[PDB]
RNA sequence: UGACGGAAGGGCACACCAGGAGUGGAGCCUGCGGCUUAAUUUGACUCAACACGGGAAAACUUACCAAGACCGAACAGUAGAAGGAAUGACAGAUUAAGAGUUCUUUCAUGAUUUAUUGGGUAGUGGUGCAUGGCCGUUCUUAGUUGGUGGAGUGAUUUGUCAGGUUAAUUCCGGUAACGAACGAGACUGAAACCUAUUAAUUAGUUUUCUGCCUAUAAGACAGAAAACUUCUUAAAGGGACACAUUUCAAAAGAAAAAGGAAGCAUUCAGCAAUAACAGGUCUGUGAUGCCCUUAGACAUCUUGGGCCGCACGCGCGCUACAAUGGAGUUACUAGAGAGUACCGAGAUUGAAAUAGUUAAGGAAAACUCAAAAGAACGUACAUGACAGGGAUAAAUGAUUGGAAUUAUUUGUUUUGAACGAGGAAUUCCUUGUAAUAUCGAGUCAUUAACUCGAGAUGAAUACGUCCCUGCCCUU
């Protein structure tokens, strides 16, 4: 269940703007992105919503190569 | 007892019950077998071996004169029977006397059912490309 | 081949085989259970 | 009376009804028109078959191309 | 756990024997026939006649209107004389026409304009009768 | 008559095709550890049989 | 089992489902769930259970249960008459004794897992009431039933027995 | 002859049953003006007792299958007497 | 008072309806003790009004199974796990479809090369 | 092709016209074969008196 | 004086009174499809380029039966290679001519498809690629508009397939597609 | 007459009374519907008439 | 650069392994080869030909054969010609023919056309090695490319890779490459849930009134009425993304377990790139080029036959070889389909059955439309070609059709054949799947042993490896 660049890319492209909107619970996460990033698809709002929270988790426990936010 | 009867110039075996003892009877199946012994009112499920034959001679004669016993005219193995008479009474070793005159009868004026008779080939009609392929 | 007669743990099976009686016959003593299986004692 | 619209999208006959919209908007069953045909023209080729269907959905009332209405 | 409504409350098989020696002129076909076309052996049970009338009344019991087709499917077996694969066919409608218009003659059944229904008196009878059989099932 | 060895870990799947486990077995005896091939689904935690522990089973 | 029904053997008692758990312990055999949609679940159903779903093979007989279902439990009672013990007790020893413990593969001399023990316990029991049982007079319930009595302590004329000590001999050759 | 068809076949009675069709009935009346042989493609019609001494061609698929009708080759078709091909070798 | 509940099975469909009385269970109107397939009696069995109108008879039977113990915890509830999972949760499992090429699901005619 | 003196007029009367490529039914409208209304207008085009589009086994004859 | 008694009427089965809904829609789409195709034979020269029930018939209509984007309409498009390949224009210069009027007219890509004897006796096919274009998922049985039409030459008959890719205009969206917003 | 017996053969059982509406040809009918479009005809156009290679 | 290797390295697929069901052996249905005939029309011949051309052919289809007729010879010019170009015809003969085809015979209608030169036209005629379109295949796996840049004189190469990971050039990573596009993914349909929303008929439930019936006390049935939405139908939403714990691999990810209706991309499908075959179809087409035939036709039509012919060979399948069964009686249980003037056919009634005479409702959640495998019931059958098997035949009874012979389909009695689980070889398959038995639809005046779908019972064996057949990358 690896990750494509369609759905990395715009969950890094995410983070580096709206940090602070996105917290470690994946429901808001849902939420958010609905309304930050216009996706016509609920699946596809679901894993892009699925990396961002997994990202924070690295993030919150330090820097990340790929996101400078 | 006896496991070996005679009725119709016809050995049976007296192990069976009487209904498919019956069966050895060229003229008599299955169905035909069953009604008889509703006709000669006999129990079913006694072996035909333990049957007196003072039931025999109406059994046999039952067999022979089915018409006037009260048997359906549907239910006769020679119905418009031809060379006169217009009924079965082909409970006997006549099956084969009525059948081998049959296709002589068709033979006789070349009828094309007739002819695959002789050639000995598929006499109804079907594919004998690939069926029936008994070597010769 | 058998030839088992037709005249005259309990299944009409084993009853059968070294009475040397048919099957049919291994009924009627075992009377004198389900419509699949008669099993005695 | 009756008010019978039936079409084959179920976007339009969902549109008519709330804009008629009072009895509820009754939904008879989905009916499928399922055709399947050999793909190729001719007989050569693999054994391929593509499955073909159309839709009819049908909504009853009491009191754009594609759809009908009826009154009764 | 137990009580007795209707003829639902007796199992299926032991009512219509308790319904059958309580049953009717026998016609002349009765040991010359099956019971259909699928079938090749005429019934072994000598009063199979009766025991085919309790369950062509019981099944009118259940169903309102019934008519001679619908016992034709029920009492129907599979057609496999040849090397085609069996293909279910229906029963036969004479003997099954000839019973319902003898239940017609002691007034156990009638005649609804879509089909044949129960009597009041054949409501009684066919409720007095799953009663015993019910006593005699709870013992 | 025979000695019992349960089972350590998978070497990997041996034998041309894969149907042959090559396990690391330790008798519970004797606490020793021996080498042998196995046919059929096995798990670490499964207990094995032997009705002979002589054969150091390698395939060179 | 039928609302009227210890392993010796160490290496079969955890992949035994007899009553370690209360899901094992049955009314009948027919659970319908779902026990080969990962590795190593079927060890979770019942030994019944395996059993039973042997008794429905070569073609004819494809997807018949109740069928097979009830053979079985005409059987153990047969079973409990011969040894007047439990049949399902006595039907465990039978996988004990029937069980290869050791087997030929290209030959070449190699042990078999536990799990294969049962599964090949179960499959040779259960040709040899099949073949027993066809073409005779014997009902299948009964020849199966002694086949498993005759399997349970020793008996060679078993069918079961007679393959085990067939393959177990060759593999003793093809070491 | 309505009455001599219900002792045949129940093919043949029924395909007598049915209104006799145009191209039987002026075959028929052909086979009255003759005796003289007929030739006819019609392979349908039914041996009846109006005929017997008719001596008829029948169109086989190429040629005239000559065939004098006789009293013992009754309700069978006519057609069955002129094969359709070479048997076998 | 009532409450109502159903189970499913792969196309069985029992409406049950709990209610308080004297502890009659009934399908369809018969007795639960005059089930049709005698076997599967004891498996039903591991004021209640239940009605089958799907599947086949033995998909009927786990689902009646369903209905009984659905109902007394939604009768409980309002006003099992540990024997087994699937009496209080649908069977996922359907039929699959057929597809052209084979006479099953997975199925595939015979392939011929001389 | 040899057609009803009364008939040629009828067509040429009414005549937009179209006609059935299919020659074994006659033509609804006249009640004669579709042959003689193909075969007598089918000339008729060559005159550049029509046009013979022909669409789906139906001939639309429009000057 | 003719031996027949068949009668093909010139009905349509969509003036029918009593008509299931099944065969309804059926005889519908079909009659659609045979209109469509009727006065596409007579308007080529024109460019009729779709009918709903063009880029001084109604009579046929009853006997028989009893646009500002010209550069994405594809039918009028493939039409204008048909009229420029029979007028003896040259494949290559014909056709580049025609994808610059497409790309001009607010495409996001189109391809056209030649296939037949341009060179020679034996043969040949060439594709004509412009802008981004996806050819497999769902959405192209939504962004696709496109036309078959083959030329009669000289020598024989030569294929032309024209397609375009729409715009978000014919509403909604790609598969991937994010675009997120900023503040 | 010259045309008498032309076409005196009557066709109404169908199969060669049937015929595709626009193909003409008498094999691979698809009578479903009252389409009576045979195959290689109703491939082409099954999307205007709204069939969909759905599933 | 590509292709190939009885070269290496790394991966993958029912490719094999552990297995299930098998086919091959018997009878029969069907296709192909062969032989025969006047004809037994023809395309296709390894996967990618052989129940394939939706090809279940009595007439038509029809392409072949024997006869017979016949123009479906436009348009233009000539001849002829309303004092008749020509067309049709009862009766006799000729002809299978009620084709006036022709001949003896005169009776009707009237330029609608006969003979003429060009010329088109027509064709299931050839040519898929002249083409379009469609399809199959390479190839169901993961591959392909151009814009600028670096290298080479050049074809060309890097980008498109060491390692790891993934179903996947999918990513982490790496870096003379950077930024992209297609392909995968993303996407669409079905299934897996909603006691929350929306609704209530043609779905269902509940309640009430009337009548009737039995119990020990609850209910049942029938005829009505008028309420609710759990089921049913179906719209919008919600709902899983491996998020989240443990372990393993500062990273992509992997493996249990719990929760969940749902956790292999959740499953089954649909769409599916660049390049290519001189792969199938001009016998699907009023799409077509060229060649061929063109009034004694290879165009068209009628009649009869053939595609069904059997010394043998091969492919797809059905039924069987029985007691895990056959025969008789009883209760039963679905899902998805289809239906008009005439189609799907209820109820009544004639009978032994197929079927017949009258006959409601329904353009349909309304009416028709209906389950068997399996289950239960007996002092039935008892292992024997027996009552397993139902071929081959003989009599007879009905339907469809203009027509049933070379049996269209089917009923009753009788007839009782090979077949005792099948050699070398070989096919399909990993979960509601295989297998088994059945239902609907396509074709359809009448005809399934086929195909496309639908449910109903529900196995065993793996969680692996390249050994075979093969792919895909890299030296």
Same mark, same amino acid.
């Given at each position: 269940?690896?990750?494509?660049?369609?759905?990395?890319?715009?969950?890094?492209?995410?983070?580096?703007?709206?940090?602070?909107?996105?917290?470690?619970?994946?429901?808001?996460?849902?939420?958010?992105?609905?309304?930050?990033?216009?996706?016509?698809?609920?699946?596809?709002?679901?894993?892009?919503?699925?990396?961002?929270?997994?990202?924070?988790?690295?993030?919150?426990?330090?820097?990340?190569?790929?996101?400078?936010? | 007892?006896?496991?070996?009867? +005679?009725?119709?110039?016809?050995?049976?075996?007296?192990?069976?019950?009487?209904?498919?003892?019956?069966?050895?009877?060229?003229?008599?199946?299955?169905?035909?077998?069953?009604?008889?012994?509703?006709?000669?009112?006999? =129990?079913?499920?006694?072996?035909?071996?333990?049957?007196?034959?003072?039931?025999?001679?109406?059994?046999?004669?039952?067999?022979?004169?089915?018409?006037?016993?009260?048997?359906?005219?549907?239910?006769?193995?020679?119905?418009?029977?031809?060379? =006169?008479?217009? =009924?079965?009474?082909?409970?006997?070793?006549?099956?084969?006397?009525?059948?081998?005159?049959?296709?002589?009868?068709?033979?006789?004026?070349?009828?094309?059912?007739?002819? +695959?008779?002789?050639?000995?080939?598929?006499?109804?009609?079907?594919?004998?490309?690939?069926?029936?392929?008994?070597? +010769? | 081949?058998?030839?088992?007669?037709?005249?005259?743990?309990?299944?009409?099976?084993?009853?059968?085989?070294?009475?040397?009686?048919?099957?049919?016959?291994?009924?009627?003593?075992?009377?004198?259970?389900?419509?699949?299986?008669?099993?005695?004692? | 009376?009756?008010?019978?619209?039936?079409?084959? *999208?179920?976007?339009?006959?969902?549109?008519?009804?709330?804009?008629? *919209?009072?009895?509820?908007?009754?939904?008879?069953?989905?009916?499928?028109?399922?055709?399947?045909?050999?793909?190729?023209?001719?007989?050569?080729?693999? *054994?391929?078959?593509?499955?073909?269907?159309?839709?009819?959905? *049908?909504?009853?009332?009491?009191?754009?191309?594609?759809?009908?209405?009826?009154?009764? | 756990?137990?009580?007795?409504?209707?003829?639902?409350?007796?199992?299926?098989?032991?009512?219509?024997? @308790?319904?059958?020696?309580?049953?009717?002129?026998?016609?002349?076909?009765?040991?010359?026939?099956?019971?259909?076309?699928?079938?090749?052996?005429?019934?072994?049970?000598?009063?199979?006649?009766?025991?085919?009338?309790?369950?062509? @009344?019981?099944?009118?019991?259940?169903?309102?209107?019934?008519?001679?087709?619908?016992?034709?499917?029920?009492?129907?077996?599979?057609?496999?004389?040849?090397?085609?694969?069996?293909?279910?066919?229906?029963?036969?409608?004479?003997?099954?026409?000839?019973?319902?218009?003898?239940?017609?003659?002691?007034?156990?059944?009638?005649?609804?304009?879509?089909?044949?229904?129960?009597?009041?008196?054949?409501?009684?009878?066919?409720?007095?009768? @799953?009663?015993?059989?019910?006593?005699?099932?709870?013992? | 008559?025979?000695?019992?060895?349960?089972? %350590?870990?998978?070497?990997?799947? %041996?034998?041309?095709?894969?149907?042959?486990?090559?396990?690391?077995?330790?008798?519970?005896?004797?606490?020793?550890?021996?080498?042998?091939?196995?046919?059929?689904?096995?798990?670490?935690?499964?207990?094995? %049989?032997?009705?002979?522990?002589?054969?150091?089973?390698?395939?060179? | 089992?039928?609302?009227?029904?210890?392993?010796?053997?160490?290496?079969?008692?955890?992949?035994?489902?007899?009553?370690?758990?209360?899901?094992?312990?049955?009314?009948?055999?027919?659970?319908?769930?779902?026990?080969?949609?990962?590795?190593?679940?079927? /060890?979770?159903?019942?030994?019944?259970?395996?059993?039973?779903?042997?008794?429905?093979?070569?073609?004819?007989?494809?997807?018949?249960?109740?069928?097979?279902?009830?053979?079985?439990?005409?059987?153990?009672? /047969?079973?409990?008459?011969?040894?007047?013990?439990?049949? /399902?007790?006595?039907?465990?020893?039978?996988?004990?004794?029937?069980?290869?413990?050791?087997?030929?593969?290209?030959?070449?001399?190699?042990?078999?897992?536990?799990?294969?023990? /049962?599964?090949?316990?179960?499959?040779?029991?259960?040709?040899?009431?099949?073949?027993?049982?066809?073409?005779?007079?014997?009902?299948?319930?009964?020849?199966?039933?002694?086949?498993?009595?005759?399997?349970?302590?020793?008996?060679?004329?078993?069918?079961?027995?007679?393959?085990?000590?067939?393959?177990?001999?060759?593999?003793?050759?093809?070491? | 002859?309505?009455?001599?068809?219900?002792?045949?076949?129940?093919?043949?009675?029924?395909?007598?049953?049915?209104?006799?069709?145009?191209?039987?009935?002026?075959?028929?009346?052909?086979?009255?003006?003759?005796?003289?042989?007929?030739?006819?493609?019609?392979?349908?019609?039914?041996?009846?007792?109006?005929?017997?001494?008719?001596?008829?061609?029948?169109?086989?698929?190429?040629?005239?299958?000559?065939?004098?009708?006789?009293?013992?080759?009754?309700?069978?078709?006519?057609?069955?007497?002129?094969?359709?091909?070479?048997?076998?070798? | 008072?009532?409450?109502?509940?159903?189970?499913?099975?792969?196309?069985?469909?029992?409406?049950?309806?709990?209610?308080?009385?004297?502890?009659?269970?009934?399908?369809?109107?018969?007795?639960?003790?005059?089930?049709?397939?005698?076997?599967?009696?004891?498996?039903?069995?591991?004021?209640?009004?239940?009605?089958?109108?799907?599947?086949?008879?033995?998909?009927?039977?786990?689902?009646?199974?369903?209905?009984?113990?659905?109902?007394?915890?939604?009768?409980?509830?309002?006003?099992?796990?540990?024997?087994?999972?699937?009496?209080?949760?649908?069977?996922?499992?359907?039929?699959?479809?057929?597809?052209?090429?084979?006479?099953?699901?997975?199925?595939?005619?015979?392939?011929?090369?001389? | 092709?040899?057609?009803?003196?009364?008939?040629?007029?009828?067509?040429?009367?009414?005549?937009?016209?179209?006609?059935?490529?299919?020659? #074994?039914?006659?033509?609804?409208?006249?009640?004669?074969?579709?042959?003689? #209304?193909?075969?007598?207008?089918?000339?008729?085009?060559?005159?550049?008196? #029509?046009?013979?589009?022909?669409?789906?086994?139906?001939?639309?004859?429009?000057? | 004086?003719?031996?027949?008694?068949?009668?093909?009427?010139?009905?349509?089965?969509?003036?029918?009174?009593?008509?299931?809904?099944?065969?309804?829609?059926?005889?519908?789409?079909?009659?659609?499809?045979?209109?469509?195709?009727?006065?596409?034979?007579?308007?080529?020269?024109?460019?009729?380029?779709?009918?709903?029930?063009?880029?001084?018939?109604?009579?046929?209509?009853?006997?028989?039966?009893?646009?500002?984007?010209?550069?994405?309409?594809?039918?009028?498009?493939?039409?204008?290679?048909?009229?420029?390949?029979?007028?003896?224009?040259?494949?290559?210069?014909?056709?580049?001519?025609?994808?610059?009027?497409?790309?001009?007219?607010?495409?996001?890509?189109?391809?056209?498809?030649?296939?037949?004897?341009?060179?020679?006796?034996?043969?040949?096919?060439?594709?004509?690629?412009?802008?981004?274009?996806?050819?497999?998922?769902?959405?192209?049985?939504?962004?696709?508009?496109?036309?078959?039409?083959?030329?009669?030459?000289?020598?024989?008959?030569?294929?032309?397939?024209?397609?375009?890719?729409?715009?978000?205009?014919?509403?909604?969206?790609?598969?991937?597609?994010?675009?997120?917003?900023?503040? | 007459?010259?045309?008498?017996?032309?076409?005196?053969?009557?066709?109404?059982?169908?199969?060669?009374?049937?015929?595709?509406?626009?193909?003409?040809?008498?094999?691979?009918?698809?009578?479903?519907?009252?389409?009576?479009?045979?195959?290689?005809?109703?491939?082409?156009?099954?999307?205007?008439?709204?069939?969909?290679?759905?599933?």
């Amino acid at each position: 269940g690896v990750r494509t660049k369609t759905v990395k890319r715009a969950a890094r492209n995410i983070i580096e703007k709206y940090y602070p909107l996105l917290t470690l619970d994946f429901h808001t996460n849902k939420r958010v992105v609905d309304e930050v990033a216009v996706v016509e698809t609920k699946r596809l709002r679901n894993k892009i919503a699925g990396f961002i929270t997994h990202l924070m988790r690295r993030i919150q426990k330090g820097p990340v190569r790929g996101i400078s936010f | 007892f006896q496991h070996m009867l +005679r009725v119709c110039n016809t050995n049976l075996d007296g192990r069976r019950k009487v209904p498919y003892a019956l069966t050895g009877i060229k003229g008599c199946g299955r169905r035909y077998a069953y009604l008889v012994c509703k006709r000669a009112g006999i =129990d079913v499920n006694k072996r035909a071996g333990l049957m007196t034959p003072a039931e025999i001679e109406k059994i046999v004669d039952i067999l022979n004169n089915p018409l006037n016993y009260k048997i359906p005219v549907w239910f006769l193995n020679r119905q418009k029977d031809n060379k =006169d008479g217009k =009924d079965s009474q082909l409970i006997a070793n006549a099956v084969e006397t009525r059948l081998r005159e049959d296709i002589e009868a068709l033979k006789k004026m070349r009828a094309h059912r007739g002819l +695959r008779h002789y050639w000995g080939l598929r006499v109804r009609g079907q594919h004998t490309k690939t069926t029936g392929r008994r070597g +010769r | 081949k058998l030839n088992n007669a037709v005249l005259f743990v309990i299944t009409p099976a084993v009853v059968a085989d070294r009475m040397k009686i048919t099957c049919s016959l291994a009924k009627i003593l075992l009377k004198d259970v389900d419509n699949h299986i008669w099993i005695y004692t | 009376i009756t008010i019978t619209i039936t079409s084959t *999208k179920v976007k339009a006959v969902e549109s008519l009804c709330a804009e008629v *919209k009072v009895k509820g908007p009754v939904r008879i069953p989905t009916k499928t028109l399922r055709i399947t045909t050999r793909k190729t023209p001719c007989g050569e080729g693999s *054994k391929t078959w593509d499955h073909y269907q159309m839709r009819i959905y *049908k909504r009853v009332l009491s009191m754009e191309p594609g759809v009908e209405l009826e009154v009764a | 756990m137990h009580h007795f409504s209707n003829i639902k409350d007796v199992v299926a098989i032991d009512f219509i024997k @308790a319904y059958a020696e309580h049953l009717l002129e026998i016609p002349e076909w009765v040991d010359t026939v099956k019971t259909g076309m699928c079938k090749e052996l005429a019934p072994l049970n000598p009063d199979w006649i009766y025991i085919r009338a309790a369950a062509i @009344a019981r099944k009118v019991y259940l169903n309102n209107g019934i008519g001679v087709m619908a016992l034709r499917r029920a009492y129907g077996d599979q057609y496999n004389k040849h090397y085609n694969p069996s293909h279910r066919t229906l029963g036969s409608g004479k003997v099954n026409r000839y019973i319902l218009q003898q239940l017609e003659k002691m007034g156990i059944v009638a005649k609804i304009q879509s089909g044949r229904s129960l009597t009041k008196e054949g409501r009684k009878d066919m409720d007095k009768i @799953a009663f015993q059989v019910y006593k005699e099932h709870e013992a | 008559p025979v000695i019992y060895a349960q089972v %350590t870990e998978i070497l990997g799947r %041996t034998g041309s095709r894969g149907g042959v486990l090559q396990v690391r077995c330790d008798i519970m005896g004797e606490n020793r550890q021996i080498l042998r091939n196995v046919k059929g689904p096995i798990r670490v935690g499964d207990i094995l %049989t032997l009705l002979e522990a002589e054969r150091e089973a390698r395939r060179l | 089992l039928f609302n009227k029904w210890t392993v010796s053997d160490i290496s079969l008692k955890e992949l035994l489902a007899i009553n370690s758990k209360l899901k094992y312990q049955v009314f009948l055999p027919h659970t319908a769930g779902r026990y080969q949609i990962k590795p190593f679940r079927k /060890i979770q159903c019942p030994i019944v259970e395996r059993l039973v779903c042997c008794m429905m093979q070569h073609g004819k007989n494809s997807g018949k249960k109740l069928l097979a279902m009830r053979v079985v439990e005409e059987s153990f009672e /047969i079973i409990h008459l011969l040894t007047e013990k439990n049949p /399902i007790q006595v039907l465990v020893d039978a996988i004990i004794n029937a069980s290869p413990r050791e087997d030929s593969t290209r030959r070449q001399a190699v042990d078999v897992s536990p799990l294969r023990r /049962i599964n090949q316990a179960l499959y040779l029991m259960t040709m040899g009431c099949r073949s027993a049982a066809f073409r005779n007079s014997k009902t299948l319930a009964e020849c199966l039933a002694d086949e498993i009595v005759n399997a349970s302590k020793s008996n060679t004329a078993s069918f079961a027995i007679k393959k085990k000590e067939d393959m177990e001999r060759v593999a003793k050759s093809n070491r | 002859e309505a009455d001599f068809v219900k002792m045949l076949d129940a093919r043949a009675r029924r395909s007598y049953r049915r209104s006799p069709k145009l191209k039987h009935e002026r075959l028929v009346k052909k086979l009255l003006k003759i005796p003289k042989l007929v030739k006819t493609h019609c392979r349908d019609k039914i041996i009846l007792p109006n005929m017997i001494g008719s001596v008829i061609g029948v169109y086989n698929g190429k040629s005239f299958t000559t065939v004098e009708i006789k009293p013992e080759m009754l309700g069978h078709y006519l057609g069955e007497f002129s094969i359709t091909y070479k048997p076998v070798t | 008072k009532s409450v109502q509940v159903f189970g499913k099975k792969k196309t069985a469909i029992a409406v049950c309806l709990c209610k308080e009385g004297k502890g009659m269970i009934r399908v369809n109107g018969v007795p639960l003790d005059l089930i049709n397939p005698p076997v599967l009696r004891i498996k039903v069995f591991e004021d209640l009004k239940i009605r089958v109108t799907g599947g086949g008879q033995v998909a009927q039977a786990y689902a009646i199974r369903q209905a009984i113990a659905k109902a007394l915890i939604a009768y409980n509830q309002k006003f099992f796990l540990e024997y087994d999972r699937t009496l209080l949760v649908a069977d996922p499992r359907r039929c699959e479809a057929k597809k052209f090429g084979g006479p099953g699901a997975r199925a595939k005619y015979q392939k011929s090369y001389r | 092709m040899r057609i009803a003196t009364k008939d040629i007029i009828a067509i040429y009367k009414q005549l937009c016209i179209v006609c059935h490529k299919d020659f #074994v039914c006659l033509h609804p409208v006249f009640g004669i074969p579709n042959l003689q #209304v193909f075969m007598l207008m089918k000339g008729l085009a060559t005159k550049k008196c #029509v046009k013979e589009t022909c669409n789906w086994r139906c001939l639309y004859w429009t000057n | 004086m003719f031996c027949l008694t068949k009668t093909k009427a010139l009905n349509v089965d969509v003036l029918k009174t009593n008509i299931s809904r099944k065969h309804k829609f059926v005889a519908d789409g079909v009659f659609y499809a045979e209109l469509n195709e009727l006065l596409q034979r007579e308007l080529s020269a024109d460019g009729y380029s779709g009918v709903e029930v063009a880029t001084d018939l109604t009579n046929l209509l009853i006997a028989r039966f009893g646009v500002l984007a010209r550069g994405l309409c594809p039918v009028s498009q493939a039409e204008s290679i048909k009229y420029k390949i029979a007028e003896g224009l040259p494949v290559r210069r014909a056709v580049g001519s025609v994808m610059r009027l497409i790309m001009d007219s607010g495409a996001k890509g189109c391809e056209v498809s030649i296939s037949g004897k341009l060179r020679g006796q034996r043969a040949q096919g060439m594709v004509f690629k412009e802008g981004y274009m996806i050819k497999s998922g769902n959405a192209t049985r939504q962004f696709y508009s496109s036309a078959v039409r083959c030329v009669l030459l000289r020598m024989g008959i030569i294929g032309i397939k024209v397609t375009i890719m729409l715009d978000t205009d014919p509403s909604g969206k790609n598969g991937p597609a994010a675009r997120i917003p900023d503040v | 007459g010259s045309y008498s017996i032309y076409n005196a053969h009557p066709r109404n059982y169908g199969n060669g009374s049937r015929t595709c509406r626009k193909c003409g040809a008498r094999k691979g009918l698809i009578r479903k519907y009252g389409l009576d479009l045979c195959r290689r005809c109703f491939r082409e156009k099954a999307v205007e008439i709204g069939f969909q290679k759905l599933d």
